[PDB]
Scaffold this active site. Sequence first.
Site, short mmCIF file in Angstrom:
data_model
loop_
_atom_site.label_atom_id
_atom_site.label_comp_id
_atom_site.label_asym_id
_atom_site.label_seq_id
_atom_site.Cartn_x
_atom_site.Cartn_y
_atom_site.Cartn_z
N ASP A 1 -75.79 -10.44 -64.26
CA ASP A 1 -74.89 -10.57 -63.05
C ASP A 1 -76.20 -11.48 -61.47
O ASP A 1 -75.37 -11.99 -61.07
CB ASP A 1 -74.86 -9.14 -62.85
CG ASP A 1 -74.30 -8.10 -62.88
OD1 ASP A 1 -72.91 -8.59 -64.27
OD2 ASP A 1 -74.40 -6.70 -63.15
N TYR B 1 -68.52 -4.20 -61.50
CA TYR B 1 -70.13 -2.92 -61.46
C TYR B 1 -69.98 -2.89 -59.55
O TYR B 1 -69.70 -4.26 -58.43
CB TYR B 1 -71.28 -4.22 -61.44
#
Lengths: 621, 621
Positions: free
Chosen positions: B290, B374
């Site tokens: 990420d 997410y």
Amino acid sequence: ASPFRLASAGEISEVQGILRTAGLLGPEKRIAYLGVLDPARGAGSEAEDRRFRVFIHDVSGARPQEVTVSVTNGTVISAVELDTAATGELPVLEEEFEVVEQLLATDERWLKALAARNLDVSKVRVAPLSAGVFEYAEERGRRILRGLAFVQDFPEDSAWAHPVDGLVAYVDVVSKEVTRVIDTGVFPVPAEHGNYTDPELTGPLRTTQKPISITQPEGPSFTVTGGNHIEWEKWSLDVGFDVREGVVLHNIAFRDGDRLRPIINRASIAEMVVPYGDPSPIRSWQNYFDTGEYLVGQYANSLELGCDCLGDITYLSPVISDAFGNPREIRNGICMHEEDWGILAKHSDLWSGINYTRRNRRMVISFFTTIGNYDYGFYWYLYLDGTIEFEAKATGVVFTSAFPEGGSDNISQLAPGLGAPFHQHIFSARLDMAIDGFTNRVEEEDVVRQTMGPGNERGNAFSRKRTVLTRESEAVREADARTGRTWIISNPESKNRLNEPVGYKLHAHNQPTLLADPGSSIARRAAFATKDLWVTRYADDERYPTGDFVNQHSGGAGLPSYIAQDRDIDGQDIVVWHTFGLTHFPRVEDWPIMPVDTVGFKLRPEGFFDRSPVLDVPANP
Amino acid sequence: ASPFRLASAGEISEVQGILRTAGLLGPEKRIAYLGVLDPARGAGSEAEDRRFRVFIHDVSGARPQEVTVSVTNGTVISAVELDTAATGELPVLEEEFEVVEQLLATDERWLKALAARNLDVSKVRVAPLSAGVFEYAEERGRRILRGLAFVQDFPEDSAWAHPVDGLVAYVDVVSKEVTRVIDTGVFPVPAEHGNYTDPELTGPLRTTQKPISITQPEGPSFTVTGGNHIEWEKWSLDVGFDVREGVVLHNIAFRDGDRLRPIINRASIAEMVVPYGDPSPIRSWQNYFDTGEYLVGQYANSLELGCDCLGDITYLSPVISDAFGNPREIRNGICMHEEDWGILAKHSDLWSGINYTRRNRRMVISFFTTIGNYDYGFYWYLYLDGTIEFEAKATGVVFTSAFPEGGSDNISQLAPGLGAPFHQHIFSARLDMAIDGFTNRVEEEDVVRQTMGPGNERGNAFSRKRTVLTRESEAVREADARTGRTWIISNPESKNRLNEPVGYKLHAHNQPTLLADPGSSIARRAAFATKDLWVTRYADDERYPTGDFVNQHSGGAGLPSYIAQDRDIDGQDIVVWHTFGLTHFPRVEDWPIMPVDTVGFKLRPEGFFDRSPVLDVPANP
Ligand SMILES: [Cu+2]
Ligand SMILES: [Cu+2]
Ligand code: NA
Ligand code: NA
């Protein structure tokens, strides 16, 4: 009336009257413990039977008694004389607070030790320190306290700054005799004060803190009915209070749609002990069972609004018995309030264009207690999502000693000449489980690493394994943080909509357990503390992990005896006992008064619900 | 002007202009990363030199470049063409959001797979999934994304409810070609919706939540100067923001009396990765960095007052570059506020008669980001007592798959036919230490159990041991929760008043580290994640534990290469890299939108101060 209501002043007075009329409470008697008993299984139907258990000391030297009374019927149910050499001494009495100091002040050996050190006996404080069980044969069957000296330079001085090392004494608090005075040699008594309200030590107080105001303009979201029944955000429970355990939670349940679903039948801290790791003979006997020996509920503080509990607070003022059977209220002893708890759930979705945020909150039920130098806050939390958490907050003043001139492997330095012996604070949470009812089991869940090879050619796979604990002999478990070990309590007869058993997962902090040698007195008296998790079959009389009479009990009592029964725990009425604690090497920052440090555990739903239980939480105003 | 100030819109425009004038930013160029560099060591004196680092992609197929500019002087400092097969591809570009879906929608193999499943291509969503490095030789030196299909029944539908298992495709986003379409067989596409704002699924919204109001009638206790310099309750620091790392903290220091004492020079989350544990070839390649591949700062949310951050909030609105070098503000992207934090210290002393209670509070600096499914909140906390803490809050929608009809060792069931593959979320905190200055060392501290015998006849003693990590080859450490393992960063040349080195102790959560087989691609690309703690010697160019170009980088980069230098770290300028993460076996309660779960770490003073640093906190109003 709820059978789980708090004891009232009138019930305690009734117990007093019943004991009096039965010949069990003459003027030589002192109540060392008194509390309501929980209802028996299957008793819900019907009719009141409020029973109280009482431990009665006798100051004249006669044997003490354990008595159960029916306050409903005005009768004695059982009364038995105790052989304390066999089953243990009674908890320390409040009226013993000053007895050790008083006895010692007229003892020639004690006075000789003080005179060598040029200490004024009128300035020497001594506490009722629990004795444990060591090598002294004369102590067996006798009520003994030990005493350590601390100097108060003036009446508002913090005596903890001025420990008198090299000196310890033992007394008998029934015969009012000093049995031993031990002097291993003179250590300098630390000179600096520890007066945390003296401007010379605090400095000018900060003027930089602006107020943080927490209010509820419409009042709180929970209701209290029947004195102690809470309804909040789908949760239902009863808040009990026992002089030994403190705040107890009963009947924790969650309203899922139109069904009230049980989760935990009873939650408490059933023991807490502070073992010390200094091998000096001045302190090597010291292990304070704050719960079992001292009774933490007895010393619950009265909590000041705006100070101890901030926001919109609903207080309970529980009632306990004094040593004569008179009721005594602990005003504002229990705080209840809801707190904002940040973000509950959040997602910003590019494909749907929906941006979603919801806030969390928790219900808090707390009390604070003081045992000598220690002060502890006990907090239970219920979250919107179904999580249950306990947190202990440890503060107070650290227990001090001299700091040895050559340094020490077992004591840390706090100030010039001032030491802090190493110790632990170890709790046992007794969780009488009722996941969707009483038919429960426990599985140990570990992560499972997988080897790269056929079926896993990229070496990325990982899994989980669950092992059912089927009998008590299999149910004494240790942590394994490296493998993410947790324990799941499930109901094998209650499935969610995906045909999986409903469950809750216990998440431990995986802190060290009892460090003492396994052959020590403390490892035997606090055997619970040597393992992270125990599971037993429910039995009415299995209340504490250390047994009923902890004070001066020889090793063996409690959990290790109960699990010898090797009972079936696979889909049965079971109790989880989780050990958790802090290991404290005190720091300079802990002196002269300690900032809070914390430890605890939580339980999270694990396929208990059919989907998130917080989809009906609205957006925040 | 502070050299640590946030980048301004004008600085970014200046970088654009400088690159343009130098011939480095023609119409085929796209900025994939741009951020200010921190000042060099010993540069404090003097004079501005604000430098920016830039990664520049080329859509025409030419090689990308890494460029450093001096915005102060209007010059290019360095510009180098990158060989991406050697050093890695550039971070995923925003403009790639829709490219995988777009390419696939006209590919006959993709359309054949969708037609077999009776899926309308106009309803099929696909994301730019990072590719990693596996067995496909044609991908080396090419910019590849992978794609997984999710059906949206209507434009506001949650596609995550409807994964299309058995199907994956790979594309080249420069040549705009579909390289592979893999169909392992038809799985039912889960039918139920996951629309958490649909009343049919939420039920009637609760009307039971009464407001909780948090206000500061006199405003906050912190000040912000120079745009991003914070002064609060003796703490001093600068709040940075980088498009890759998100919020960064600089110059964390504490004013102890009249001395500003450094603690941490720079704190950041320097990597975060989500490795998946499902060996299906549909997902066994998936590991989302990420931070390093996607850039978490880029996707920072705009935070809504009263919703995301409650109370008296001071916002920062950091500026980043778009793909063309134009500045873009993230409005209200960083929240700053102080929170009440319960009891700080409390003691009720029987001997002195003094009852003392003080409240704690913490400064919060936070942001929230969204990466695909997410959403993560990153929170830094500073406490009155000197504790520093980081907490990550993980939420969003779980990444879904089919639930295999026979069950699964690597996927859990969420809804009928709907699965969630197992995964971890693993963070690396890069803590460039400066305990009382830059001369620092790290010790590993374990509790030490002692055997009952001579010198310990009661078997109660326990101790501690500290082992200095003297060189980088010795400084790759693992957790040991059972022995209470922590790591102390100290300054061996700065002693407290008790003649002990000042220090701070890192307390980890001791969660599992990377579970993948040690020979896997992910273990090699995310080697940092295999160990809890690394210590390196500071070097300007050692910024990320995974190296500078993570996307499609073969294994080896970052920390394992840096420590091969085997540098002296015993009383030197050092950096601690702490790995911590969550291991997620998704539960039914996580669907259709996940409640927050948390992980983090803290550092507590360890003889840094000469006594408690909070004795000057006044009693609460
Ligand atoms: Cu302690
Ligand atoms: Cu997850
Ligand atoms: Na039970
Ligand atoms: Na450093």
